[PDB]
């Protein structure tokens, strides 16, 4: 029952970090089997902020959407909110509703794929699933989740047969050199739980198609939606009866999978890995909020987000501070940018790339280091969950308490890698619980009002900010318009907050801090590093842009 841990002392580099978006190198120093220091080194620069200079502000959303295709949509949304603010247009109610529903659909697609397809292979030994008794697995499945045909012994055996045929083919494909091959002490699950999870991994590949189809009814297509414009949205058909009926039907199927498979699997895995509620914690959390009832200004977004905004520091859940947009800045001291760029508020942002060399601990990442009132901030589902729970948001109180009771852990146990993983599931369940209400609101609004884009005029000179809480956290785009063109356009993205390097004072970012104390059972197969890194759900194309 002690967490497995070697006596290894030395360096470990993991490059590539797989099962993330984008290109990350993690370096750690290990002593007596525990990580004592860490570096998060982002390995690709594209320079979208530089590319945007001089362009039409209307074009920004189309470029910035291509910051990332995993968190597709969210940058188009942040850019649209940003330019809307810069031109001082208030979007019509229907456009607020449609934009927020497309975000909801994105949360469902993204979190389902993350848990199963990115994260689960850190906890689930797929080859051990071949050793499971499918009837025992079916019985376990019936005890921990709602009755469903996909959990039958016959269904689970068919999964086992497919996997056996694949493994015995000699071409292991995506499982080649998996850390669990041949057994690994850090993998705790009974074979039956491995089999249930593996069956659901395969089902989730089909279910994510349906989640993307729902999103595309409103968004035009997925990936890379095409329904937002300055002043609102273009998709008049998305306000109408039959499309919204299909959107609801698909969303209900996806939510059934969330409630029948994702949450029960997440809780089952969490129960076996309760030690991971004591590994990977950080202390400060930031959210801009999402799902606002008033998106007429950034301040109204912060105030009216149904998943609320806020700042928590020092794990103090007794106080949530308002977000001060003027207090955000980015450092470059430990990044691959020119000296002189520390301490810049994004309206004054500078993106002047300057590479040095691999593993230069003075300059080791293409990410900037965003800071808030001098502190690093963790953003994402865990940040939203703590902020909402602290404020007594009733859905978060209900679903968090459900998890705390199931696992017999306090809210403080969520300051951890297990907690970060759990929070992603908690908020997915909450989005699901709100879909019918949000769809009905938009259906009723669209039936009585087809205003979807407001009138606006391009100012000669202005500035604006667009805020969103994307699936990975607090996202902001910041524009300076001069001569009716983009003079500066800065993105500050959730993975920038989470996985950027040290700031100007040499202070570790959230992932770097979270990695301190990681036990390493086998330095050649450092799954524990992956568990924590993956729990932040990294997107390096997002983080660097």
């Amino acid at each position: 029952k002690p967490t497995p841990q070697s006596t290894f002392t030395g360096p470990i580099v993991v490059d590539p970090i797989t099962r993330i978006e984008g290109h990350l190198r993690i370096m750690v120093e290990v002593e007596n089997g525990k990580v004592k220091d860490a570096w998060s080194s982002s390995q690709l620069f594209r320079g979208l902020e530089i590319i945007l200079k001089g362009r039409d502000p209307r074009d920004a959303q189309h470029f910035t959407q291509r910051a990332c295709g995993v968190c597709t949509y969210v940058h188009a949304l942040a850019s649209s909110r940003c330019v809307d603010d810069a031109v001082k247009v208030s979007i019509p109610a229907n456009a607020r509703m449609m934009r927020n529903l497309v975000m909801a659909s994105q949360y469902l697609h993204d979190h389902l794929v993350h848990f199963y397809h990115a994260h689960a292979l850190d906890w689930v030994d797929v080859t051990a699933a071949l050793k499971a008794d499918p009837n025992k697995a079916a019985k376990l499945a019936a005890s921990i989740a709602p009755a469903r045909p996909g959990n039958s012994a016959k269904a689970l055996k068919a999964v086992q047969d497919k996997l056996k045929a694949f493994v015995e083919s000699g071409q292991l494909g995506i499982f080649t050199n998996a850390y669990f091959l041949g057994g690994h002490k850090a993998y705790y699950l009974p074979p039956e739980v491995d089999l249930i999870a593996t069956a659901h991994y395969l089902e989730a590949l089909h279910m994510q198609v349906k989640a993307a189809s729902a999103m595309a009814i409103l968004g035009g297509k997925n990936p890379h939606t095409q329904f937002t414009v300055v002043g609102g949205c273009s998709n008049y058909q998305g306000l109408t009866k039959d499309p919204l009926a299909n959107y609801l039907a698909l969303s209900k199927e996806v939510c059934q999978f969330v409630n029948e498979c994702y949450i029960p699997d997440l809780l089952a895995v969490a129960g076996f890995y309760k030690d991971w509620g004591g590994i990977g914690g950080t202390s400060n959390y930031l959210a801009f909020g999402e799902f606002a009832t008033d998106d007429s200004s950034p301040e109204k977004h912060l105030a009216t987000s149904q998943f609320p905004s806020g700042v928590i520091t020092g794990r103090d859940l007794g106080k949530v501070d308002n977000v001060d947009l003027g207090a955000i800045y980015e450092d470059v001291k430990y990044s691959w940018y020119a000296p002189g760029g520390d301490g810049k508020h994004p309206y004054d942002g500078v993106t002047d790339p300057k590479y040095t060399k691999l593993d230069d601990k003075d300059h080791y990442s293409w990410m900037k280091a965003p800071r808030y009132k001098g502190k690093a901030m963790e953003v994402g589902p865990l940040a939203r969950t703590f902020i909402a729970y602290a404020k007594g948001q009733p859905d978060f109180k209900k679903v968090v308490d459900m998890v705390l009771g199931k696992l017999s852990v306090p809210a403080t146990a969520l300051h951890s890698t297990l907690g970060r993983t759990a929070a992603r599931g908690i908020e997915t369940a909450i989005v699901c619980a709100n879909m019918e209400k949000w769809i009905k609101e938009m259906a009723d609004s669209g039936a009585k009002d087809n205003t979807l884009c407001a009138k606006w005029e391009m100012p000669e000179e202005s500035k604006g900010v667009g805020l969103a809480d994307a699936p990975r956290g607090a996202l902001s785009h910041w524009i300076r318009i001069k001569g009716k063109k983009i003079d500066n356009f800065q993105l500050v993205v959730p993975s920038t907050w989470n996985l950027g390097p040290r700031g100007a004072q040499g202070d570790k970012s959230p992932v770097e801090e979270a990695l301190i104390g990681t036990p390493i059972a086998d330095p050649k197969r450092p799954v524990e590093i992956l568990r924590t890194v993956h729990a932040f759900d990294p997107c390096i194309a997002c983080g660097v842009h």
Partner: protein, 263 residues
Amino acid sequence: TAKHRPSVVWLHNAECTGCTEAAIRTIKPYIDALILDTISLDYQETIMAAAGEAAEAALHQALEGKDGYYLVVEGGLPTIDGGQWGMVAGHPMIETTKKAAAKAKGIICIGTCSAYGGVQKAKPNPSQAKGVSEALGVKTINIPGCPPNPINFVGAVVHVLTKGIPDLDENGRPKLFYGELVHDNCPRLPHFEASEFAPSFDSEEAKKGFCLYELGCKGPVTYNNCPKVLFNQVNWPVQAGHPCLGCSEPDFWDTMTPFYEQG
């Protein structure tokens, strides 16, 4: 029994991963059937279990496979500063792609980025990003779009494995999917022909589904099959009231902008 499904090595260079995401939206077949039954997907950073040295070892195992392999490339190649602004396992992306391309049975560029350079190549091109053929002087099968429809990517993969190289146009795109203009199959074409246009997004003409040409639609100059096959079995941009950006055309970020005008 000695068995072998064709080996596919998938590299991610300067990309947003939207092309990987598009590929997994396939339903004919679903991605699980494809990778269990039809191909052996031997390296793919976004979904593979191995990481770090174990992942690099899996790559080398695939590249050295005696049966050979097909190469899928996602993303452009950042060439500035000796390729050092885009690295995997401490190696420049251009170096690894050059090596993999040299011995590949065939090269499929998924997306406008690998085909033609894409978003990071847009002016002023900070990283000196290039398309694969642009950088390496090798011929590629291009499946462009930002991202391409899975129908086009998976269709091309299946075609290459079972029939051979599909007929390609002058931009290296299979005519099966890219032979026709978006516009020629657009349901708003009768409006275009009658010069019935939406003058703004808030207009009654937009609500009525009039043609989006005055709002910048690049359908008339873009080769893709979007209105014919749809995305996600439900929609495409013009059906959602928005002009085509021209996203399957080379260098569209510079040739099709401003997006809301006819430049």
